[PDB]
């Protein structure tokens, strides 16, 4: 705990400041320290955790794809060595997030909104690990992402309305997993379409603000269906 001496409330406050300054590495370190205080996260705090590590790993994934594309065209060791360096750093961030979820965010999350959120995160960061895997552990990494997504899907369909933004974002990312990772484009298209239609039929129950939350993620599902069909 490098953040062990700072107050939990101060870590959350500085995480929000780091977001405003677009200092996402600092933001992730603050939220990691907040999680390691041992207390469950509020809805707002879960968002801060997601924002921080998504931006950090997002820049790592973008850099990895640039280097891997240069490496593919070439095939000295410099390009391979540097792609390996970024890849190792990306895997360390993914392992850090997965460690936080396993110790002990998931086991203490009883509510559907918190448990589905954490299981979706678990699937996401195993998916990011699967994007760069090439050895003997790729299939087990892929199945770990699939298992986390599947448990989140089972809970969300039981406890959430079809328009719930977390349920929508979960289905969106699980469909991306099917298309990009699992080589199951028809499963990806079927999931994205049924998720869109069932949310469309539930929009009439929502307020103006909840309507905007749901239709925003429904547009992402529509964008993928347009790209895939």
């Amino acid at each position: 705990g490098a953040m062990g001496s700072m107050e939990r409330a101060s870590l959350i406050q500085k995480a929000k400041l780091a977001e405003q300054a677009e200092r996402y590495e600092d933001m992730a370190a603050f939220m990691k320290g907040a999680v390691e205080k041992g207390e469950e996260l509020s809805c707002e705090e879960r968002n801060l955790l997601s924002v921080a590590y998504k931006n950090v790993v997002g820049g790592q994934r973008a850099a990895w794809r640039v280097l891997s594309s240069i490496e593919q065209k070439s095939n000295g060791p410099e390009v391979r060595e540097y792609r390996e360096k970024v890849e190792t750093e990306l895997q360390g961030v993914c392992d850090t997030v997965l460690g936080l979820l396993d110790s002990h965010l998931i086991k203490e999350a009883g509510d559907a909104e918190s448990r589905v959120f954490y299981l979706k995160m678990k699937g996401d960061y195993y998916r990011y690990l699967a994007e760069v895997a090439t050895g003997d552990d790729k299939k087990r990494i892929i199945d770990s992402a699939r298992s986390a997504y599947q448990e989140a899907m089972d809970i969300s369909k039981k406890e959430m309305p079809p328009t719930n933004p977390i349920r929508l974002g979960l289905a969106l990312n699980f469909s991306v997993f099917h298309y990009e990772i699992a080589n199951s484009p028809e499963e990806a298209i079927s999931l994205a379409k049924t998720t869109f239609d069932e949310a469309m039929a539930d929009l009439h129950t929502l307020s103006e603000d909840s309507y905007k939350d749901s239709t925003l993620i429904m547009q992402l599902l529509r964008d993928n269906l347009t790209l895939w069909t």
């Binding site: 996401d124 969106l172 298309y179 990009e180 964008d223």
Partner: peptide
């Protein structure tokens, strides 16, 4: 290539 979930703009 496809879109995973991302924050609103």
């Amino acid at each position: 290539r496809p879109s995973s979930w991302r924050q609103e703009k």
